[PDB]
Amino acid sequence: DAALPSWMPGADLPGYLNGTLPGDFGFDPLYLGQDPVKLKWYAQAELMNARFAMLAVAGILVPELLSNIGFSWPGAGVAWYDAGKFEYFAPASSLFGVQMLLFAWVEIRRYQDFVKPGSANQDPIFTNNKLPDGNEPGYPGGIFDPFGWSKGDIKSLKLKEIKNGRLAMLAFAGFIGQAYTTGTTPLKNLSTHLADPWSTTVWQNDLARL
Amino acid sequence: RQSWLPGSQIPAHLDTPAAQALAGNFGFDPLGLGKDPVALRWYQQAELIHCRTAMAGVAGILIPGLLTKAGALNVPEWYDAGKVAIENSFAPWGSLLAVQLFLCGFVEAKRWQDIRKPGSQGEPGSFLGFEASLKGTSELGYPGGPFDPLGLSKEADKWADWKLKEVKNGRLAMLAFLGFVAQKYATGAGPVDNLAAHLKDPWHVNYATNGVSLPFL
Amino acid sequence: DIAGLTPCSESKAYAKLEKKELKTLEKRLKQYEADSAPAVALKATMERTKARFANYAKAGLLCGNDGLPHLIADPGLALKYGHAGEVFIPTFGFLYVAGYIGYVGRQYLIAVKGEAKPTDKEIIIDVPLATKLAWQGAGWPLAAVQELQRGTLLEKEENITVSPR
Amino acid sequence: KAGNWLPGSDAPAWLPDDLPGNYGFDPLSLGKEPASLKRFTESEVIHGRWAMLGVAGSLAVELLGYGNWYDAPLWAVNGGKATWFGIEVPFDLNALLAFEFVAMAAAEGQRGDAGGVVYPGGAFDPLGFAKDSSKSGELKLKEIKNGRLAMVAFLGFVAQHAATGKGPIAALGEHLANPWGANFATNGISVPFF
Numbered sequence: 097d098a099a100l101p102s103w104m105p106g107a108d109l110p111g112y113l114n115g116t117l118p119g120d121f122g123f124d125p126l127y128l129g130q131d132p133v134k135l136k137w138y139a140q141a142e143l144m145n146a147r148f149a150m151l152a153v154a155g156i157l158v159p160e161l162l163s164n165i166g167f168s169w170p171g172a173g174v175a176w177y178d179a180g181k182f183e184y185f186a187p188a189s190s191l192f193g194v195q196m197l198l199f200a201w202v203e204i205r206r207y208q209d210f211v212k213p214g215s216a217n218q219d220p221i222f223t224n225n226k227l228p229d230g231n232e233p234g235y236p237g238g239i240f241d242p243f244g245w246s247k248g249d250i251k252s253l254k255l256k257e258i259k260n261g262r263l264a265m266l267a268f269a270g271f272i273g274q275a276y277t278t279g280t281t282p283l284k285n286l287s288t289h290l291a292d293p294w295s296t297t298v299w300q301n302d303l304a305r306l
Numbered sequence: 307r308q309s310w311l312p313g314s315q316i317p318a319h320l321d322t323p324a325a326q327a328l329a330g331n332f333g334f335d336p337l338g339l340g341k342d343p344v345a346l347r348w349y350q351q352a353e354l355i356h357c358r359t360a361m362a363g364v365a366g367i368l369i370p371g372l373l374t375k376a377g378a379l380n381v382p383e384w385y386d387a388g389k390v391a392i393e394n395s396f397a398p399w400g401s402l403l404a405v406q407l408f409l410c411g412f413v414e415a416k417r418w419q420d421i422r423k424p425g426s427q428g429e430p431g432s433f434l435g436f437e438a439s440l441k442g443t444s445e446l447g448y449p450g451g452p453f454d455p456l457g458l459s460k461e462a463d464k465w466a467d468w469k470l471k472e473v474k475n476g477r478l479a480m481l482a483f484l485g486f487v488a489q490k491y492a493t494g495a496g497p498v499d500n501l502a503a504h505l506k507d508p509w510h511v512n513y514a515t516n517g518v519s520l521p522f523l
Numbered sequence: 524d525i526a527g528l529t530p531c532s533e534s535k536a537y538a539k540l541e542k543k544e545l546k547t548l549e550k551r552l553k554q555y556e557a558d559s560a561p562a563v564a565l566k567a568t569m570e571r572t573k574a575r576f577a578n579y580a581k582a583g584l585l586c587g588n589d590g591l592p593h594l595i596a597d598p599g600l601a602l603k604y605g606h607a608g609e610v611f612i613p614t615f616g617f618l619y620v621a622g623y624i625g626y627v628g629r630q631y632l633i634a635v636k637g638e639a640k641p642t643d644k645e646i647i648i649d650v651p652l653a654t655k656l657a658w659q660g661a662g663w664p665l666a667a668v669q670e671l672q673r674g675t676l677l678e679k680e681e682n683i684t685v686s687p688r
Numbered sequence: 689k690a691g692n693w694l695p696g697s698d699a700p701a702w703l704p705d706d707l708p709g710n711y712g713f714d715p716l717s718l719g720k721e722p723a724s725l726k727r728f729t730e731s732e733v734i735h736g737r738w739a740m741l742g743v744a745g746s747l748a749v750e751l752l753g754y755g756n757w758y759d760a761p762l763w764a765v766n767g768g769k770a771t772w773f774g775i776e777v778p779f780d781l782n783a784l785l786a787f788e789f790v791a792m793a794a795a796e797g798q799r800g801d802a803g804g805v806v807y808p809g810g811a812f813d814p815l816g817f818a819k820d821s822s823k824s825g826e827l828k829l830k831e832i833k834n835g836r837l838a839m840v841a842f843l844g845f846v847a848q849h850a851a852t853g854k855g856p857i858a859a860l861g862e863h864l865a866n867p868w869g870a871n872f873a874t875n876g877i878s879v880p881f882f
């Protein structure tokens with residue numbers, strides 16, 4: 097509600113969005129972050145869902161692109177939605193069991209910081225090890241920023257993080273929809289479009305499926 | 307003031323500050339059942355227990371049903387699950403119900419006595435040292451203590467929102483159970499089938515075409 | 524089953540009564556032309572008779588040696604043997620309607636009593652108020668218990684007139 | 689304070705600093721009332737002492753090839769006789785039940801009438817050990833920690849058997865044989881689906 101960037105040039109934006117969070121373009125048509133305590137939780141949520149979505153999309157597209165090329169390895173042409181039934185060294189169940197244990201420790205360590213900032217910046221075992229005092233929930237830094245990037249224009253870097261994440265979160269949503277609708281991998285869906293974009297729009301595809 | 311019917315006259319007994327302190331107060335009491343404050347307090351407790359039981363039961367009918375529809379589960383339909391479970395149980399239904407009434411009656415009596423006099427179950431020396439925790443909070447129907455293991459009720463800036471979600475989700479689950487009973491008698495199928503069938507042809511598959519709900523049309 | 528009675532569905536007297544009833548209606552249906560309005564009416568009564576004898580038997584009513592349905596009024600026998608729609612359920616249906624009328628009328632008398640001329644509101648009915656109470660009477664049972672528990676339902680003896688004794 | 693069970697959390701004030709095993713863990717506020725905390729303190733030590741003997745004898749029998757803790761009473765349920773270290777014990781369940789009841793009621797009655805004495809002495813503390821408070825404190829911390837560990841161990845034994853139906857040593861062998869194939873997530877009980 098000032099002169100900060102807007103999702104719709106000329107609109108009256110919500111005052112609660114004041115440009116303190118990265119990517120504050122005043123977009124809250126349903127007035128969800130109007131309450132400050134909800135907005136505080138939603139900021140971390142958006143950052144967490146974005147950071148996993150960014151890793152996911154990378155780990156979904158890179159292997160497919162390598163598969164198209166001559167790159168050889170166990171996965172090869174394994175479709176992301178078919179990776180679960182793939183046979184690995186250990187039973188899925190076992191792996192999941194380990195994953196939930198390992199994550200219980202890290203999530204509750206991250207959650208402790210969020211509820212009390214700077215309360216989990218110390219190594220439980222090697223007490224001497226720790227994270228620099230200056231810390232905000234969602235931005236642990238220290239050994240999580242091993243190259244010092246945070247030191248430079250941190251605000252621009254945080255905006256690049258939120259922007260790339262929102263696109264990744266939308267990409268994953270695409271992968272889910274396009275996979276269930278076109279029943280094929282994303283880079284295959286892109287090849288179909290690049291071959292004949294005009295005749296390969298969701299409109300025509302869904303019309304044919306009707 | 308939110309109203310169940312914009313423009314209608316809200317009962318004065320629901321506009322009183324104490325009544326407005328109650329979660330889900332949309333000024334709805336057309337029959338005037340809660341005009342008496344003492345009755346309004348009993349009915350608020352009754353609504354909370356119905357809400358929390360309906361939410362647990364409906365979750366135990368829909369969630370398993372969707373998982374079975376997918377395949378992750380093979381649970382029988384809610385209206386056939388008693389027979390299936392008792393078929394291979396360690397006890398007949400009558401013995402299982404007798405044990406249920408004993409254990410439920412005991413905890414229901416303690417909750418009852420807490421309504422008659424809040425904090426009474428903390429009577430020192432009444433429960434091998436647990437009575438101290440058996441005392442609820444300043445709000446009847448919200449015991450907390452051991453019943454709030456994660457201490458979410460300790461955040462005063464989120465208390466009201468949490469109670470509104472519990473009452474609204476509870477009122478919805480109460481209506482979803484009535485719907486499960488009515489739809490079972492009018493269709494002869496389960497709630498997940500009823501949903502799929504309607505979604506296939508909503509304009510020809512509904513309660514107006516069930517041959518029961520509207521015997522006049 | 525109970526009292527030595529027999530299901531109307533298996534009673535021979537029940538069957539003979541239905542035939543006897545339909546034969547009277549048929550002896551009369553003859554003197555009339557097939558489409559004649561008299562004929563149509565006798566046919567609809569015959570259909571209604573057939574449905575009654577069938578509906579009563581399906582309801583599991585018991586029949587005495589007279590071949591007529593007998594009603595079981597013991598709550599214990601009715602519930603254990605499937606005869607609760609005969610007297611038990613009807614009892615709670617009537618009690619709800621009768622209490623409805625009583626509680627609404629009591630609420631009306633109490634409301635008009637605080638007016639200028641209660642007697643006038645008894646000869647000329649305050650329709651709007653009467654309609655309001657009529658709709659609010661659905662929850663009378665809970666209201667009656669809440670009044671019984673507040674001690675507001677009854678009147679103090681000290682305020683009620685009596686003869687010298 | 690022996691430590692913080694949850695780093696970054698503040699200890700409940702009602703928990704005394706000297707209280708042995710005080711890791712500031714009372715999230716449900718059960719020990720908030722002093723009387724309640726007193727009873728729970730004694731009960732916790734008693735539970736730990738019993739469990740530390742139960743775990744020991746539950747592992748010993750199996751390690752000595754005398755069977756597992758779960759199958760130890762089946763002799764009574766069947767027509768089998770009672771054995772101990774292989775040596776046969778001539779007693780029916782009824783005899784054992786009556787003997788234990790009287791023995792337990794007697795000793796437990798003396799302990800109960802005493803008044804919550806968690807740390808007696810003399811007969812219960814021969815070989816000195818708890819004569820000096822300085823040693824007593826650490827020795828009381830070691831007892832509670834070993835007792836709590838043994839209580840979690842026993843529950844693990846009961847849970848593992850309820851899911852696999854095998855003895856505690858037999859499981860340790862299965863897991864060591866195939867850790868990624870033999871674990872709680874690979875039993876079809878602990879983790880649903882899969």
Ligand code: CLA
Pocket residue numbers: 263266267269270271272273274277278285286288289296297298299301302
């Ligand atoms: C940045 C996200 C993103 C991107 C780049 C794409 C890209 C593509 N999608 Mg798509 N999709 C997305 C998200 C996305 N999708 C989401 C969130 C959904 C809903 C779950 C879908 C559901 C979907 C279906 C059902 C289909 C596609 C299809 C396609 C392909 C061409 C046909 C088409 O345009 O359909 C239309 C796609 C949309 C209308 C989604 C809008 C695009 C999102 C909202 C980005 C917003 C626009 C913004 C300016 C960014 C542009 C991208 C940027 C890199 C320039 C194409 C390569 C078709 C296909 O598979 O081809 C074979 C197809 O049938 N998508």
Ligand code: CLA
Pocket residue numbers: 597598599600603
């Ligand atoms: C108001 C007058 C009245 C009268 C004269 C009766 C008479 C009778 N009742 Mg009864 N009953 C009544 C009111 C009455 N009832 C009411 C208001 C209720 C609602 C709770 C019931 C509920 C009831 C049940 C559940 C049962 C009976 C049964 C019976 C028969 C045997 C009961 C008995 O032993 O002594 C007479 C009973 C009373 C004077 C008062 C109530 C009945 C008691 C409480 C039931 C005890 C029955 C007992 C198990 C004996 C039968 C053993 C076995 C055959 C079940 C008997 C002819 C039993 C029967 O025959 O079922 C097949 C049966 O089990 N009644």
Ligand code: CLA
Pocket residue numbers: 624625626627628629631632648653656
């Ligand atoms: C508000 C109306 C009302 C109510 C609540 C009652 C209530 C009662 N009456 Mg009663 N009575 C009424 C009207 C009413 N009466 C009228 C209009 C008459 C004149 C006929 C009588 C004549 C009467 C007699 C002779 C006796 C009772 C008796 C009784 C008591 C025993 C139960 C009973 O109902 O017996 C049965 C009562 C009746 C069969 C009378 C039927 C009256 C109709 C059905 C009520 C309609 C009232 C009015 C038209 C509704 C106005 C609604 C408003 C919105 C406009 C009971 C407390 C008995 C008693 O004293 O027991 C202790 C008793 O012997 N009443």
Ligand SMILES: CC1=C[C@H](O)CC(C)(C)[C@H]1/C=C/C(C)=C/C=C/C(C)=C/C=C/C=C(C)/C=C/C=C(C)/C=C/C1=C(C)C[C@H](O)CC1(C)C
Pocket residue numbers: 334335336337338339356357359360362363364366367383384385386387388479480481483484
């Ligand atoms: C407020 C008002 C006021 C004004 O004045 C008037 C009026 C209007 C009257 C009023 C209204 C009212 C209403 C609406 C009510 C409703 C209610 C309900 C529906 C409830 C439910 C309620 C419901 C509930 C509880 C539920 C419960 C359930 C459960 C437990 C479950 C169970 C189960 C399951 C799991 C499964 C299996 O297999 C089976 C079973 C066994 C079955």
Ligand SMILES: CC1=C(/C=C/C(C)=C/C=C/C(C)=C/C=C\C=C(C)\C=C\C=C(C)\C=C\C2=C(C)C[C@@H](O)CC2(C)C)C(C)(C)CCC1
Pocket residue numbers: 596597598610611614621622623624625626629667
């Ligand atoms: C609330 C209400 C009213 C009622 C007011 C008052 C005070 C009514 C008084 C009720 C009193 C004092 C009743 C006293 C005793 C009643 C008793 C002992 C009950 C007897 C019933 C029995 C034995 C049951 C018999 C059976 C049952 C189970 C049902 C059927 O199966 C039939 C049968 C006989 C087998 C107002 C104002 C008239 C207005 C209106 C609504």
Ligand SMILES: CCCCCCCCCCCCO[C@@H]1O[C@H](CO)[C@@H](O[C@H]2O[C@H](CO)[C@@H](O)[C@H](O)[C@H]2O)[C@H](O)[C@H]1O
Pocket residue numbers: 796797800801803804
């Ligand atoms: C009808 C069959 C089923 C019911 C069986 C009932 C069995 C008998 C009653 C249950 C056992 C009672 O258990 C009882 O617990 C209390 C708890 O303080 C013990 O009480 C003990 O400690 C307290 C102080 O802490 C003392 O005041 C008490 O004098 C002392 O004995 C009793 O010693 C014990 O006997």
